[PDB]
RNA sequence: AUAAACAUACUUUGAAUCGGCCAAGUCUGGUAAGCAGGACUGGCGAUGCGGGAUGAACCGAACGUCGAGAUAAAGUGCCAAA
RNA sequence: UAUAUACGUUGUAUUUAUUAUCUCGUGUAUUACUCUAUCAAAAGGGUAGUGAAUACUGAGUUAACAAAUUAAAGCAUAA
């Protein structure tokens, strides 16, 4: 067959490098990936430790022409893309095609906010981290190094939560009423023949 | 003459998973003793699969 | 042409089906089971399937 | 009409750090997560079905397939080894393969 | 405050191994990582053995008057007094385990009926909810 | 005790070579050196292959053209098979 | 995530969850379904109508062999 669907990974409560390792392997397996909220990913170490690591990264620059040198993107979605690209084959068509299937966005844009979200249990922070190990969000580190769109994402996320809060409230009312109407059908006298099969196999 | 599996007995309902009638369900009658193949009628009034 | 001549004998031999068709309708939901295609839905792994 | 196959991903050729042996292809079957669920698929049929845009004046088929068999597992994670009539093209890495339910043993 | 503790008398559910989804009772705590479980071998079938805590799950039942190193003779007596088997079968985990046993013995024909029936019932229940 | 008949003993004629370098449960001169010079053995030179990212000498192992398997050094988050 | 209480709801993510095809039968109900109109709107929006699918919920016909994505050529007019 063909995989025309997109696997949407909610990067909230995940580790940057463990998410990247799993995605970079599956990108090579033909899957299409979108990593929403690539700014909520967590990295080990306090902000002071992370900023020192950034300064070492920012030092790498071609002496004779900095425009040829390493480009140090500050956007967290570009922080993740740098991590994933490092785990993919270099300078061959296989690794370029794999990276063409990956996207982060700093929030949840228009098509991906109503899609089914997935989680990577290997990359969950609650599993691979000592709770007292201090972590940093990619967004918080991004702002400290010059990411200008930190509060734009916060505003867009605040609207998204309040829209989903009433969609979920409305959908819950429908599901509660449907569940009751299903209980009247299951207990209905005329549906005994069908229900008997359902109970025999543990579905009722 | 191919030795049949123990599960294939006359009257058992089979599922064809290859060939033209893949996915169809047929009724096993007996084995073709001159070829070793199964003679199945996926009753034509129901399946549309002939003998 | 051959299908035209072979049709009258192919149809006739379906007198075998008269017993099995009647016995299929006796079991509830068996008639619908036999006509429908067999499919692997989502979550059915062949190594875990018992038929 | 119906689904009678399982998507297996052409992971790559049986290889080492720096060598590669295209006689055996490594497939990752969907739903098989351990080597202990592999014994069912040993000996099954596998087809790499691909589409070719033929010309109108050509009699070559639009749909072609390469058939093979699953022969052995590869590691403790449900990856299997497959041998095909002709070695799979390495431009098909990451593409999906059909694992059939025959030769049946049920 | 926490509701479930690793203690002597706490009924635990084995999650992995040859005795997965079988009930067990903690009888002695070796250290923070290992406990001795002797879910009565004459009742549940789990022998007295040392298990890492990563391979069990605590339940809400604690057998009364279970002491450290309680013998299998007496443990069986107290296990049936609190009716742990009866009570466990009424919990969400108890029904989840029973369902899995029911499903694993369903053939193709049985799964065919359920899908047909469940689709009609669910669709019928959706029709019965008005849109005003 | 063990091994040894395509064993053993050779005879004649002749080639090339006698700038060597490396390792170390070794040594001397030197503060020391990827320094100079030695004792025993294994190497590189003359040698590719698997591994140590890269490397004359390290580790595994020495090579007719191939197929299928068990392996060696060493590995099993991704690049990279596990 | 040391998550108010209670429960641990166990134990297979994507690809990959429709009972073969067509016809016959009457209304209701439902929909992140389609289209039209309108109010709105960088909405899985509201209102009215229409069709489609499904449930109440049927019955009948047919199947046997077969078959079931772009190529090749031009320059009249217009910006």
TrEMBL record, chain A:
Q: Which GO terms describe its biological process?
A: negative regulation of translation; translation
Q: Name one Pfam family in it.
A: Ribosomal_L13
Q: Name one GO cellular component term.
A: ribosome
Instruction: Say if the entry is tagged with keyword Ribonucleoprotein.
Output: yes
State the source organism's domain of life.
Answer: Eukaryota
UniProt entry keywords in alphabetical sequence: Ribonucleoprotein, Ribosomal protein
Record bears the keyword Ribosomal protein: yes
Which Gene3D superfamilies does the record associate with it?
Ribosomal protein L13 (3.90.1180.10)
Q: Which GO terms describe its molecular function?
A: mRNA binding; structural constituent of ribosome
**Record-annotated membrane-spanning stretches:** none
PANTHER family membership? LARGE RIBOSOMAL SUBUNIT PROTEIN UL13, RIBOSOMAL PROTEIN L13
What family does the database annotate? Belongs to the universal ribosomal protein uL13 family.
Q: What is this protein called?
A: 60S ribosomal protein L13, putative
Name its species.
Entamoeba histolytica (strain ATCC 30459 / HM-1:IMSS / ABRM)
Automatic annotation (TrEMBL), chain B:
To which protein family does this belong? Belongs to the eukaryotic ribosomal protein eL6 family.
Which protein, by its recorded name, is this? Large ribosomal subunit protein eL6
From TrEMBL, chain D:
Q: Which PANTHER family match?
A: 60S RIBOSOMAL PROTEIN L35A
Q: GTP-binding as a keyword?
A: no
Entry's Gene Ontology cellular component terms = cytosolic large ribosomal subunit
Any one Gene Ontology BP term? cytoplasmic translation
UniProt xrefs under InterPro entries: Ribosomal_eL33, Ribosomal_eL33_sf, Transl_B-barrel_sf
Taxonomic path? Eukaryota, Amoebozoa, Evosea, Archamoebae, Mastigamoebida
What is a GO molecular function of this protein? Answer: structural constituent of ribosome
Q: Which UniProt keywords apply?
A: Ribonucleoprotein, Ribosomal protein
- Similarity field: Belongs to the eukaryotic ribosomal protein eL33 family.
Q: Could you tell me which HAMAP family the record lists for this protein? A: Ribosomal_eL33
Q: What is this protein's name? A: 60S ribosomal protein L35a, putative
Q: Does the keyword DNA repair apply?
A: no
State the species of origin: Entamoeba histolytica (strain ATCC 30459 / HM-1:IMSS / ABRM)
TrEMBL record, chain E:
Q: Which UniProt keywords apply?
A: Ribonucleoprotein, Ribosomal protein
Q: Which Pfam families match?
A: KOW (PF00467), Ribosomal_L14e (PF01929)
SUPFAM superfamilies, alphabetized: Translation proteins SH3-like domain
Tell me where in this chain the KOW domain is found: 5-32
Listed GO MF terms: RNA binding; structural constituent of ribosome
Q: List the GO biological process terms.
A: ribosomal large subunit biogenesis; translation
One GO cellular component term noted in the UniProt record for this chain? cytosolic large ribosomal subunit
Cited Gene3D superfamilies: 2.30.30.30
Q: Could you tell me the superkingdom of the organism this chain comes from?
A: Eukaryota
User: Record's CDD domains?
Assistant: eL14 (cd23702)
Q: To which protein family does this belong?
A: Belongs to the eukaryotic ribosomal protein eL14 family.
The protein's name: 60S ribosomal protein L14, putative
